[PDB]
Amino acid sequence: VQRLFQVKGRRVVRATEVPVSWESFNNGDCFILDLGNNIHQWCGSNSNRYERLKATQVSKGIRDNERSGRARVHVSEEGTEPEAMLQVLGPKPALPAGTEDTA
């Protein structure tokens, strides 16, 4: 499996599937790169607490509800991306700031 979710919001946080590419990322939200047996929860330096919380819920939700607990969740952030993420997405470009969330 190879899926990528954008976890964005303030008033209401939503997790939505986006193209599996670094071009979907930004430094203002959280992202979940689902690789099947491994799930990568990445949060931008400017992400908010609501997004980080929802990112944990979605990552653990995939792990427990979709994989029956047979997956490992890896938490990272800007600068600490694991090579497993880079092996799938390629080298990381400079990321845009991200769009302000709806308050």
| DSSP secondary structure of the chain | --EEEEEE-SSS-EEEEE-SSGGG--TTSEEEEE-SSEEEEEE-TT--HHHHHHHHHHHHHIIIIISTT-SEEEEEETT---HHHHHHH-SPPPPP--PPPP-
Q: Give exposure, 33-66, as e/b (b: 16+ Cβ within 10 Å).
A: bbbeebbbbbbbeebbebbbebbbebbeebbeee
- Residue 54 counted as an annotated binding residue: no
How far does CA 77 lie from the centroid of its chain?
9
Decide: 22 and 85 in contact? Cβ < 8 Å.
no
First to last CA, the chain: 33
- Alpha-carbon distance of 91 to 83, in angstroms, equals 9
Give 15's contacts (C-beta < 8 A, 6+ positions apart).
5, 6, 7, 32, 54, 55, 58
- Calculate ∠ Cα 15-19-24, nearest 5°: 75
Residues spanned by the domain of 40: 1-103
92 is in an annotated binding site: no
Give the integer Cα–Cα distance in Å for 46 and 29.
7
Is 64 annotated as belonging to a binding site? no
The technique by which this structure was obtained is: X-ray
What one-letter code names the amino acid at 12? V
CATH number, domain containing residue 83 = 3.40.20.10
Residue pair 81/92 in contact by the 8 Å Cβ criterion: yes
Contact 78, 7 (CB under 8 A): no
- Residue 25 assigned ligand-binding role: no
The pair of structure tokens assigned to 34 is 């689902």
The number of domains in the chain is: 1
Q: Is 29 annotated as a binding residue?
A: yes
Angstrom resolution of this structure: 1.6
